[PDB]
Amino acid sequence: CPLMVKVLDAVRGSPAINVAVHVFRKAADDTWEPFASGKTSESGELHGLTTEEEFVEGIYKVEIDTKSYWKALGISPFHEHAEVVFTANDSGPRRYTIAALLSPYSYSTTAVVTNP
Amino acid sequence: CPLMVKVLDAVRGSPAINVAVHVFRKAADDTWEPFASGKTSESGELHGLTTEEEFVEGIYKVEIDTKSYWKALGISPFHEHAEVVFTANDSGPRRYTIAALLSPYSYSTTAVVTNP
Amino acid sequence: CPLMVKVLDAVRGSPAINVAVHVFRKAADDTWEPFASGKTSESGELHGLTTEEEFVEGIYKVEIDTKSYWKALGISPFHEHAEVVFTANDSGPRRYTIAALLSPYSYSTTAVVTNP
Amino acid sequence: CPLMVKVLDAVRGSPAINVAVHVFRKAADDTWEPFASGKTSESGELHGLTTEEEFVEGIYKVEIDTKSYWKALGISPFHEHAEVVFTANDSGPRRYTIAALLSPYSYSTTAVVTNP
Numbered sequence: 220c221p222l223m224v225k226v227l228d229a230v231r232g233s234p235a236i237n238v239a240v241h242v243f244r245k246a247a248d249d250t251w252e253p254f255a256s257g258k259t260s261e262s263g264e265l266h267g268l269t270t271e272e273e274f275v276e277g278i279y280k281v282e283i284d285t286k287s288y289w290k291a292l293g294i295s296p297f298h299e300h301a302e303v304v305f306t307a308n309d310s311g312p313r314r315y316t317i318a319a320l321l322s323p324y325s326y327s328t329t330a331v332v333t334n335p
Numbered sequence: 336c337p338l339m340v341k342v343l344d345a346v347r348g349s350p351a352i353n354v355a356v357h358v359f360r361k362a363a364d365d366t367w368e369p370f371a372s373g374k375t376s377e378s379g380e381l382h383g384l385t386t387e388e389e390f391v392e393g394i395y396k397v398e399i400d401t402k403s404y405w406k407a408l409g410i411s412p413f414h415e416h417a418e419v420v421f422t423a424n425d426s427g428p429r430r431y432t433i434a435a436l437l438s439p440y441s442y443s444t445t446a447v448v449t450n451p
Numbered sequence: 452c453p454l455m456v457k458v459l460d461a462v463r464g465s466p467a468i469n470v471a472v473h474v475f476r477k478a479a480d481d482t483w484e485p486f487a488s489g490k491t492s493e494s495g496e497l498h499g500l501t502t503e504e505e506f507v508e509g510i511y512k513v514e515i516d517t518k519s520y521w522k523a524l525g526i527s528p529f530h531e532h533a534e535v536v537f538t539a540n541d542s543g544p545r546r547y548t549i550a551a552l553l554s555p556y557s558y559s560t561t562a563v564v565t566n567p
Numbered sequence: 568c569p570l571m572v573k574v575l576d577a578v579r580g581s582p583a584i585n586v587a588v589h590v591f592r593k594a595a596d597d598t599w600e601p602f603a604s605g606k607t608s609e610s611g612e613l614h615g616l617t618t619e620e621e622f623v624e625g626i627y628k629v630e631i632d633t634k635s636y637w638k639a640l641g642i643s644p645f646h647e648h649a650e651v652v653f654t655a656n657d658s659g660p661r662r663y664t665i666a667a668l669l670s671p672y673s674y675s676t677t678a679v680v681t682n683p
């Protein structure tokens with residue numbers, strides 16, 4: 220698992236379950252091409268997005284559909300989505316965790332990059 | 336000010352000065368049209384991006400150029416930028432403050448929305 | 452202002468108004484002595500806590516009464532309060548802003564420290 | 568494991584390893600009594616603090632020694648420590664995760680409370 224996404228809910232103090240997540244890779248013509256996607260599990264996590272072979276150096280975008288998440292809870296949110304844009308670099312540690320902590324008008328995101 | 340951006344640096348405990356900010360608005364053909372840009376002052380604030388007349392209903396993207404900020408300070412950060420995407424003024428004119436708190440591998444953003 | 456506190460609400464996208472704040476200073480016997488208190492204004496800010504003369508070197512604790520804020524809004528939050536503990540003025544007088552961003556099960560705090 | 572603590576480093580994008588953590592329980596005389604302690608592991612986590620039998624309803628304080636962590640990295644930080652104060656309540660879900668994301672002048676904390 221070179222890439223994992225984890226999403227938490229700061230209002231309820233829980234994992235954010237069944238949140239849609241889309242990953243894109245920047246193409247040579249500077250457009251975003253679909254790369255991988257899924258929905259967070261009951262632990263707020265999305266595993267199995269890619270493989271080491273497929274996850275080469277490049278610029279990636281992780282788009283978390285926060286608006287649908289809040290609307291399903293009956294809460295009007297601010298953002299259309301949360302976007303996390305970063306470069307994957309081989310010199311750095313192997314495994315990337317992209318974490319996001321969600322509130323209706325705010326989000327935090329951090330990267331935990333470690334060596335297996 | 337209908338739209339203001341404020342940026343803080345969590346490493347130095349200071350405003351984030353001379354941070355470039357680009358604002359885009361989604362056009363009728365679904366592309367991101369350049370809308371306004373500027374850079375943060377010594378107080379970490381960016382005022383004067385737009386006017387009440389210009390700042391119509393729409394979907395807006397505020398791109399904060401965090402990578403260039405950390406690199407101009409001689410540090411190699413994780414993200415390319417921080418993006419904040421939101422619908423504005425769809426219930427009439429509001430004042431928006433987009434605030435961000437930056438670290439090299441993490442950022443937080445929140446919105447303060449007031450009715451004049 | 453040698454010491455200012457600013458508080459935002461991540462659920463409502465607004466300043467956090469009428470939040471009680473208590474400041475303490477560690478005494479020579481290691482106990483926490485009451486130092487100053489107040490509540491945030493309509494802008495979410497609390498000014499006038501202390502003076503340059505009064506705000507000597509020491510270890511200070513700023514207690515932000517988040518539970519009472521969420522409960523006065525009719526919500527049951529996780530934390531009792533948010534505490535911010537720091538040494539101040541040990542290299543001479545500085546200006547301190549303690550900022551906090553609140554959600555029912557989470558909060559963020561940062562400091563902006565400037566030299567007059 | 569009714570109580571787990573997880574600590575992340577927002578500057579390096581890594582778990583915060585070997586961070587001292589102390590847990591206290593509020594006594595009837597309103598003083599803080601030591602309850603459990605340890606150091607975070609190579610994953611930034613501290614497990615095994617308490618048992619279901621021992622972790623009764625009450626007010627608890629988790630104190631994370633952030634100052635020593637930053638000093639060991641050669642970084643001058645702002646806070647003496649990060650403190651998280653909360654009530655344990657049986658009506659709510661069983662397992663508490665207290666997470667903290669650290670920067671030199673800022674920290675975020677959230678609670679993830681779930682049902683096994």
Ligand SMILES: O=C(c1ccc(O)cc1O)c1ccc(O)cc1O
Nearest residue numbers: 318319320327328329666668675677
């Ligand atoms: O609360 C967070 C968290 C992160 C990882 C984890 O295993 C558990 C967490 O609660 C968290 C995530 C992203 C962020 O930007 C800030 C956070 O406190």
Ligand SMILES: O=C(c1ccc(O)cc1O)c1ccc(O)cc1O
Nearest residue numbers: 436443444445457459550551552559
């Ligand atoms: O606490 C914050 C804050 C920042 C600027 C300000 O004028 C007031 C604040 O409470 C804050 C704002 C945005 C964010 O992503 C994280 C924060 O702690």
Ligand code: NA
Nearest residue numbers: 424425426427
């Ligand atoms: Na409308």
Ligand code: NA
Nearest residue numbers: 540541542543
């Ligand atoms: Na001194």
